[PDB]
Structures are given as structure tokens and as C-alpha cells.
């Protein structure tokens, strides 16, 4: 039993050594998957231009959403939607898969939220710094990869960048991976909202609605 403990303890130091290198293998792969894909869209545009055409991008599969309105004086319908999107306190945020059936939620909910398309950079810092997981109703920080594998392992996903990957690429188990993530509790934007008043449309003079790519600069000051 004194020779059964190191017998199991180093049977776990072994186990942890392998997972740690598998992760490495994956994370190193993901890098190129990104590196290439982004490169491709670049040259695709250059080529279509060369041939006198116009490359047009694929519409964004993912948005990140931030509630920017308080909780009182909200009409029943958008109020309901705000909840089903897990956005029930000001400055909390979530990711949404863009399809027709979520797209019309974002419509309904629009003058209360500000959203757009998150970069890898933003998704990375958002999960690292502020990523917590939901386990037995509890809100647990993602301090170690063990926590994610423990819960998302059944779907693949056994590291934090596994999580990030399943988010930015969307696809297979987005539902589960994204639901595993507690709504992000962002601060107010350090540096301000850039606008005299928040509750016009972003087109009208700022905040609220789809600010598209611009979402990132915001969330980075809220993060």
C-alpha cells in the first residue's frame, strides 16, 4: 500500500503526461487550421479581383451578444427572449449560433443588446479571463483543463482551446459547449461607449443593434 500509492500516483502522472501532449498536438493543429483558413479567404479575394470578379464571404456563423439595457421597463416579448438567451443582467454576454430561428430572436431583442462578430482574439481572451462552466447548477471557473474534459469530454472537448475551437468554428456540439459556458459577466466599457447616448442604433449614433465587426473593440474594453 506504500508501494501501491506511487503505483497508482505515478500511474496518474503518466496519464496526465499523455493528455498534456495530446492537447499540445491539438492546439498546434488548430493554429494551422486557423492560419490556413484565414489566409485562404485573403487570397481568394485577391484572385477573384485578379480575374475581374468579386469573392464574397460566407455569412457569419457566430455572433456574441451583450445586454446593455437594465432590467426594468422591458416589454414581455423581448424580455422573454433576453432570458432564453441567458442575458438577464446588464453587461452579461453570450454567444449565439446564427440561423433563421435565432436571427429573429436577435431582431426582437435589438434595442436592448449590442452584438456582432467575435474574433479569435476576443473569444480567446473572453474564455481565458472570464470563462466559467456550469456544473451541477454551479458556476465554476475554468482553472484547469481537467474541469472541461470532465464535462465536455463526451463530446470531444477536453481542453479550454477545445472549447474555444468548438465555439469559433461553431458546428457539432456548439449547443452543449456554449451552454456549458456560464453567461459572461463583463464590466462597463473602460474608455466609455464612444457615444453621447447608448439607446439609439449603432447606425443612428451608437450602441444597440448589430455593430458587426465592431463588437470586438467594445467587448475588449468590457473584458
Amino acid at each position: 500500500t506504500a508501494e501501491q500509492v506511487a503505483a497508482e500516483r505515478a500511474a496518474r502522472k503518466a496519464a496526465n503526461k499523455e493528455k498534456r501532449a495530446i492537447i499540445l498536438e491539438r492546439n498546434a493543429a488548430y493554429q494551422k487550421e486557423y492560419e490556413t483558413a484565414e489566409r485562404n479567404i485573403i487570397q481568394a479575394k485577391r484572385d477573384a479581383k485578379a480575374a475581374g470578379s468579386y469573392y464574397v464571404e460566407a455569412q457569419h456563423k457566430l455572433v456574441f451578444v451583450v445586454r446593455i439595457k437594465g432590467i426594468n421597463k422591458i416589454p414581455p416579448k423581448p424580455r422573454k427572449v433576453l432570458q432564453l438567451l441567458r442575458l438577464t443582467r446588464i453587461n452579461s454576454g453570450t454567444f449565439v449560433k446564427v440561423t433563421k430561428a435565432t436571427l429573429e430572436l436577435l431582431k426582437l431583442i435589438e434595442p436592448y443588446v449590442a452584438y456582432g462578430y467575435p474574433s479569435y482574439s476576443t473569444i480567446r481572451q473572453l474564455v481565458y479571463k472570464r470563462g466559467f462552466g456550469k456544473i451541477n447548477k454551479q458556476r465554476v471557473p475554468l482553472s484547469d483543463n481537467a474541469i472541461i474534459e470532465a464535462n465536455l469530454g463526451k463530446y470531444g472537448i477536453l481542453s479550454i482551446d477545445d472549447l474555444i475551437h468548438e465555439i469559433i468554428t461553431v458546428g457539432p456540439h456548439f449547443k452543449q459547449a456554449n451552454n456549458f459556458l456560464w453567461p459572461f459577466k463583463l464590466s462597463n466599457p473602460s474608455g466609455g461607449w464612444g457615444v453621447p447616448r447608448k439607446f439609439k442604433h449603432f447606425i443612428q449614433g451608437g450602441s444597440f443593434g448589430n455593430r458587426e465587426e465592431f463588437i470586438n473593440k467594445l467587448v475588449k474594453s468590457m473584458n
Binding site: R20, A28, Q31, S143, D144, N145, I160, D161
Partner: peptide, 11 residues
């Protein structure tokens, strides 16, 4: 803690 989560950072 950066290195605890995701190695590869190292490379």
C-alpha cells in the same frame, strides 16, 4: 497558469 492551461504557448 497560462502554461497550466494549453501548453503550446511555449512553442
Amino acid at each position: 497558469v497560462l502554461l497550466r492551461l494549453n501548453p503550446y504557448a511555449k512553442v
